[PDB]
Amino acid sequence: MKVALTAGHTLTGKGTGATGYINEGTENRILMDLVVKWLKKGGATVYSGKVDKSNNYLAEQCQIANKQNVDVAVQIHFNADHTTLDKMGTETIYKTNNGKVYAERVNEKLATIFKNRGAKSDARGLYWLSHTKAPAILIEVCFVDSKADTDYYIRHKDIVAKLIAEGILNKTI
Amino acid sequence: MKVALTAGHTLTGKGTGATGYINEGTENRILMDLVVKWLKKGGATVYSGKVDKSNNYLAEQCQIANKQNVDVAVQIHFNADHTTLDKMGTETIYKTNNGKVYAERVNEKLATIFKNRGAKSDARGLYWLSHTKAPAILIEVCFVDSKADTDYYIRHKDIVAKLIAEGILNKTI
Ligand SMILES: [Zn+2]
Numbered sequence: 001m002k003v004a005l006t007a008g009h010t011l012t013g014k015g016t017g018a019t020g021y022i023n024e025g026t027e028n029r030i031l032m033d034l035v036v037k038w039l040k041k042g043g044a045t046v047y048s049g050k051v052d053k054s055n056n057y058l059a060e061q062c063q064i065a066n067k068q069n070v071d072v073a074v075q076i077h078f079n080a081d082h083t084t085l086d087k088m089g090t091e092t093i094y095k096t097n098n099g100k101v102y103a104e105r106v107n108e109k110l111a112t113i114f115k116n117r118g119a120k121s122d123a124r125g126l127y128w129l130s131h132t133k134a135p136a137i138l139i140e141v142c143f144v145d146s147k148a149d150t151d152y153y154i155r156h157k158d159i160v161a162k163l164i165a166e167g168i169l170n171k172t173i
Numbered sequence: 174m175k176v177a178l179t180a181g182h183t184l185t186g187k188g189t190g191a192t193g194y195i196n197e198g199t200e201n202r203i204l205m206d207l208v209v210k211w212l213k214k215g216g217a218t219v220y221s222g223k224v225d226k227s228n229n230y231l232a233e234q235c236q237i238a239n240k241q242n243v244d245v246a247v248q249i250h251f252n253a254d255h256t257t258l259d260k261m262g263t264e265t266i267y268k269t270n271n272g273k274v275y276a277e278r279v280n281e282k283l284a285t286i287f288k289n290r291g292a293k294s295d296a297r298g299l300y301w302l303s304h305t306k307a308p309a310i311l312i313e314v315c316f317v318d319s320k321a322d323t324d325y326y327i328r329h330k331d332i333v334a335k336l337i338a339e340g341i342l343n344k345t346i
């Protein structure tokens with residue numbers, strides 16, 4: 001299968017991410033590289049990238065996916081809301097039915113290691129989900145400000161990546 | 174936190190650096206100044222310097238770090254091998270455990286923008302790592318002769334500096 005994969009957020013200027021026990025922008029890139037590795041072990045062809053500095057970063061992220069035909073376009077994020085010791089958990093966002101197929105599979109896998117918030121339809125008109133040619137999903141891996149979520153994530157990054165890849169490819173790796 | 178920073182190499186005579194798409198001695202100084210700015214933005218007390226001409230430049234570099242107590246002493250370098258279009262990447266050198274703490278954090282940050290060559294223990298008897306009072310690291314930011322490395326570096330110098338500062342201070346800036 002062909003997969004486009006992008007890390008959410010820029011590193012400076014407009015578009016930077018959230019921070020708590022972990023830094024979203026940094027971990028989006030660390031986890032991307034691990035997901036690429038696991039996707040390739042599953043036999044997929046992967047087109048990955050990131051945008052570190054640009055006022056046009058949203059369009060540039062979509063251009064990474066749109067440069068070539070792919071079966072699915074995936075963007076990695078981490079969530080935020082309020083600092084808590086409690087588990088908060090995982091959700092995967094889609095806009096339309098074609099992305100929902102993948103969002104449900106990825107969320108089912110991540111829900112075995114994080115609290116299940118479910119696959120979720122886009123309620124904020126996210127540019128990534130409306131400007132890619134391929135079916136698109138946005139993974140909110142876990143909350144940067146949950147101590148329980150991040151305690152698990154920091155010690156199991158390779159497992160998080162494997163589960164994402166297994167959900168995308170719909171198979172065990 | 175208190176940080177001592179030095180730019181690698183002299184500008185003439187004994188001790189000059191490498192050249193490729195960028196000039197190491199020049200960029201060590203440019204990037205040093207950016208790292209100082211980002212470290213100060215992160216709340217650190219910073220002592221920096223360089224040695225432009227001296228046959229005794231190694232001892233003089235260490236004296237910049239040793240003049241006052243600091244938590245970590247950092248020297249900036251760029252790597253070299255052969256001229257290539259391909260990525261070559263980043264590594265940070267330490268001698269002992271107390272520097273390894275910082276080297277691993279700096280390398281983890283720089284590996285989100287450059288190919289990851291790793292935090293590495295010194296097998297070459299670097300004077301800088303052996304003659305500093307404080308824990309010490311030597312950052313080989315990227316390769317001067319890699320077009321891919323320098324293409325990113327030249328366009329993102331502030332981001333390179335921010336990532337180094339975040340690795341040293343262990344927090345988001
Ligand atoms: Zn985000």
Ligand SMILES: [Zn+2]
Nearest residue numbers: 181190250251
């Ligand atoms: Zn050097």
